[PDB]
Amino acid sequence: LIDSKGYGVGTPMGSPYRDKITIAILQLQEEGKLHMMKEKWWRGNGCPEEE
Amino acid sequence: IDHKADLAVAPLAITYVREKVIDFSKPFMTLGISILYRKPNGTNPGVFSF
Amino acid sequence: WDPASGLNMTESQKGKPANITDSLSNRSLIVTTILEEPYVLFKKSDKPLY
Amino acid sequence: QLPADTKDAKPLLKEMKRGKEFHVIFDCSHEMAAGILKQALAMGMMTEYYH
Amino acid sequence: TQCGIWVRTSNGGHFASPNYPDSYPPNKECIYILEAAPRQRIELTFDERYYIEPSFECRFDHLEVRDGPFGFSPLIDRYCGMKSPALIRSTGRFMWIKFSSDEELEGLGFRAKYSFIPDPDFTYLGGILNPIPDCQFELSGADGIVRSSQVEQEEKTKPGQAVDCIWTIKATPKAKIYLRFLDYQMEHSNECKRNFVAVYDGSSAIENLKAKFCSTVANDVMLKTGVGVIRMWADEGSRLSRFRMLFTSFVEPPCTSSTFFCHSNMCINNSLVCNGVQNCAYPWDENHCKEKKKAGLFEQITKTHGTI
Amino acid sequence: FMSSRRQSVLVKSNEEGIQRVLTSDYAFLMESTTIEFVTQRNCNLTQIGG
Numbered sequence: 058l059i060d061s062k063g064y065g066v067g068t069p070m071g072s073p074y075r076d077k078i079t080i081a082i083l084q085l086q087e088e089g090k091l092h093m094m095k096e097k098w099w100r101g102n103g104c105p106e107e108e
Numbered sequence: 109i110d111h112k113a114d115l116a117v118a119p120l121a122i123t124y125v126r127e128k129v130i131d132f133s134k135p136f137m138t139l140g141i142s143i144l145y146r147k148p149n150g151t152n153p154g155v156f157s158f
Numbered sequence: 159w160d161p162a163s164g165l166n167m168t169e170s171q172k173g174k175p176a177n178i179t180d181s182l183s184n185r186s187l188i189v190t191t192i193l194e195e196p197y198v199l200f201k202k203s204d205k206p207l208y
Numbered sequence: 209q210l211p212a213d214t215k216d217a218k219p220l221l222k223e224m225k226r227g228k229e230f231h232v233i234f235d236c237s238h239e240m241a242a243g244i245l246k247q248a249l250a251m252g253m254m255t256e257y258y259h
Numbered sequence: 260t261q262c263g264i265w266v267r268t269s270n271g272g273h274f275a276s277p278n279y280p281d282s283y284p285p286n287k288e289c290i291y292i293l294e295a296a297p298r299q300r301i302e303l304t305f306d307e308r309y310y311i312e313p314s315f316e317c318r319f320d321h322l323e324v325r326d327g328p329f330g331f332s333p334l335i336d337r338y339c340g341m342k343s344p345a346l347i348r349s350t351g352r353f354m355w356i357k358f359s360s361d362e363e364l365e366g367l368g369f370r371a372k373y374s375f376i377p378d379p380d381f382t383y384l385g386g387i388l389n390p391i392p393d394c395q396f397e398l399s400g401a402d403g404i405v406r407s408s409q410v411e412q413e414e415k416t417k418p419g420q421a422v423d424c425i426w427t428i429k430a431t432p433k434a435k436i437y438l439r440f441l442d443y444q445m446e447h448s449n450e451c452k453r454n455f456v457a458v459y460d461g462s463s464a465i466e467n468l469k470a471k472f473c474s475t476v477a478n479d480v481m482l483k484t485g486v487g488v489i490r491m492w493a494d495e496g497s498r499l500s501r502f503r504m505l506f507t508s509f510v511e512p513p514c515t516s517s518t519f520f521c522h523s524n525m526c527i528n529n530s531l532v533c534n535g536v537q538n539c540a541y542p543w544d545e546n547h548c549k550e551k552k553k554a555g556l557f558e559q560i561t562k563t564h565g566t567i
Numbered sequence: 568f569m570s571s572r573r574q575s576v577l578v579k580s581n582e583e584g585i586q587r588v589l590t591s592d593y594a595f596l597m598e599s600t601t602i603e604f605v606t607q608r609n610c611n612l613t614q615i616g617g
């Protein structure tokens with residue numbers, strides 16, 4: 058990784074939902090759901106054949 | 109939490125429990141768990157190395 | 159005043175009326191931290207004043 | 209000010225050498241003007257720097 | 260070579276200025292130590308014969324009467340002028356007298372000897388008498404490790420309290436001292452009111468604070484005289500701090516026989532060559548030594564290889 | 568490098584730096600008009616670089 062960006066659930070300027078989603082994302086990130094989601098869609102067809 | 113300080117510029121990792129009590133900024137450094145292992149040497153390639 | 163006493167100025171620092179409570183400036187943030195290499199270290203110098 | 213009782217200006221001229229005072233205006237009589245210069249020659253103050 | 264008389268009277272000696280009572284010569288700083296014998300102290304009571312040149316706030320020719328061993332000592336008074344002082348006592352069983360001199364003066368001097376035989380009060384080490392405190396280390400030669408643990412190995416203070424111990428280094432005749440810190444650690448860095456290490460030069464007086472270290476790093480100082488003094492002020496709450504210095508006598512080079520010439524403005528004695536311990540900045544002395552041989556497969560005939 | 572290893576790779580004078588390349592393993596940095604003087608009058612030294 059050359060640069061270091063990051064995605065994020067966008068909210069309006071001064072929204073009440075920013076703090077409640079931040080607590081919700083950190084809860085999902087430690088239970089392992091955001092590794093279950095990424096390995097469901099970036100899993101792909103399951104390549105290489107013998108590597 | 110007791111307002112005896114203002115910032116916490118330190119290796120203070122954002123987690124679930126600390127975020128529920130205090131408030132962090134967005135991460136200035138991201139990281140994870142990785143593995144140390146000794147760099148390979150090649151001093152004993154067996155005895156039938158020919 | 160008294161020649162072999164100098165000024166005995168009372169000056170009291172007490173009888174001022176309640177007008178100004180001190181430290182009226184930009185608040186200096188007491189940033190707490192912990193020492194850990196290479197995040198926060200002590201500087202390696204010989205001169206003492208810090 | 210020159211000292212009142214004594215006529216020895218060594219404690220005065222030493223404070224004038226130390227303070228780097230090379231430009232002096234004496235307000236004296238000529239009987240005391242000859243007395244200071246013998247006490248300014250006994251010290252190192254009759255140089256090419258002093259006026 | 261010129262200070263005056265020291266005269267060893269059975270209790271307290273009268274000290275003269277250089278060339279009493281004529282004009283004392285310029286640039287003279289004698290460092291007179293009252294030995295102040297055990298079970299007692301000193302009481303001077305200056306003479307009426309007294310003339311040392313007056314000054315504004317005595318920043319010129321004066322006479323410090325600091326109660327204390329040397330240098331850093333607490334001050335009693337600073338006497339300059341023609342009015343003869345009096346009323347000198349002591350608050351401990353040592354007192355130090357220094358008599359400085361500028362370059363353009365004229366003055367007479369001072370005289371006082373002794374008055375004191377009662378016994379002191381406090382019991383610093385524990386008991387009845389217990390001096391203030393006996394760490395006066397006279398050591399010299401070509402080299403020697405000045406270690407901080409000598410306060411405890413030689414047992415001159417109780418564990419727990421504050422320490423103040425003084426090492427004095429003499430050198431070989433007509434030489435200087437290359438002090439070098441091998442180990443140096445403290446427990447409250449950047450705080451010279453709690454623990455520091457200072458180095459002196461020629462005398463233990465206040466003129467020669469060449470370096471005061473109370474930070475994380477100590478460096479190599481290079482003295483100009485044949486006398487060097489190292490102290491260590493560590494208080495009650497920080498008696499864990501340590502340092503291990505190493506002095507080395509040297510002469511400025513034209514290097515001759517019985518010299519080695521480390522290439523850093525130093526002639527060291529040849530006893531310091533392959534001493535096992537590095538004595539110069541870069542180990543020029545600990546080089547080209549221990550160069551044994553070639554043996555090879557001959558000495559490989561052993562318990563493991565030699566059986567095969 | 569040189570700020571870390573002070574009193575190790577920081578010489579005291581030009582004469583010691585010549586006597587350290589000549590004896591030890593050392594890469595002394597100095598003026599270019601002295602290197603063209605030393606190399607011409609000490610045939611076992613050289614100038615590398617520009």
Ligand SMILES: *[C@@H]1O[C@H](CO)[C@@H](O[C@@H]2O[C@H](CO)[C@@H](O[C@@H]3O[C@H](CO[C@H]4O[C@H](CO)[C@@H](O)[C@H](O)[C@@H]4O)[C@@H](O)[C@H](O[C@H]4O[C@H](CO)[C@@H](O)[C@H](O)[C@@H]4O)[C@@H]3O)[C@H](O)[C@H]2NC(C)=O)[C@H](O)[C@H]1NC(C)=O
Nearest residue numbers: 159160161162163164165313314315316317339340341342
């Ligand atoms: C009439 O008055 C008295 C007798 O009644 C005579 O003495 C004058 O009064 C006082 C004496 O205490 C002098 O005041 C102070 O003099 C100081 C001068 O420094 C001394 O310097 C050396 C020692 O360092 C001595 O040899 C020398 O004689 C001096 O004594 C000043 O430094 C003083 O300034 C400050 O001192 C204290 C600070 O705590 C304060 O009380 C002062 O107000 C001031 O802030 C102070 O000046 C006074 O100088 C004496 N006069 C003279 C001319 O010396 C008088 O002589 C006598 N006659 C006359 C004409 O006044």
Ligand SMILES: *[C@@H]1O[C@H](CO)[C@@H](O[C@@H]2O[C@H](CO)[C@@H](O)[C@H](O)[C@H]2NC(C)=O)[C@H](O)[C@H]1NC(C)=O
Nearest residue numbers: 159160161162163164165166167168169170171
């Ligand atoms: C300087 O003035 C103060 C008053 O502001 C003096 O203090 C008082 O002095 C009187 C008489 O000496 C005492 O009865 C009081 O008890 C003192 N009060 C306090 C709070 O100190 C002071 O003594 C004067 N200084 C000198 C040197 O005389």
Ligand SMILES: *[C@@H]1O[C@H](CO)[C@@H](O[C@@H]2O[C@H](CO)[C@@H](O)[C@H](O)[C@H]2NC(C)=O)[C@H](O)[C@H]1NC(C)=O
Nearest residue numbers: 167168169170171172173174175176177178179
């Ligand atoms: C100039 O004088 C004024 C008037 O006395 C000082 O201001 C007052 O000081 C008194 C105490 O002496 C206080 O009780 C008042 O509250 C002060 N008033 C204000 C408006 O500050 C002032 O301190 C003096 N200035 C200086 C520089 O000494």
Ligand SMILES: *[C@@H]1O[C@H](CO)[C@@H](O[C@@H]2O[C@H](CO)[C@@H](O)[C@H](O)[C@H]2NC(C)=O)[C@H](O)[C@H]1NC(C)=O
Nearest residue numbers: 546547548550586587588589590591592593611
């Ligand atoms: C080739 O060069 C090396 C360079 O180190 C030489 O070894 C040094 O030569 C100097 C000559 O002034 C002497 O001090 C010693 O012989 C060596 N110095 C040391 C070991 O510190 C030597 O001329 C040659 N060495 C070999 C192995 O051929």
Ligand SMILES: *[C@@H]1O[C@H](CO)[C@@H](O)[C@H](O)[C@H]1NC(C)=O
Nearest residue numbers: 400401402517528529530531
């Ligand atoms: C120093 O040199 C002298 C001769 O100059 C020699 O005898 C002595 O052993 C050396 N070492 C010491 C510690 O004096």
Ligand SMILES: *[C@@H]1O[C@H](CO)[C@@H](O)[C@H](O)[C@H]1NC(C)=O
Nearest residue numbers: 588589590608609610611612
């Ligand atoms: C260079 O090598 C040594 C010093 O390293 C010196 O004695 C020798 O004479 C020199 N060789 C030359 C100048 O050819």
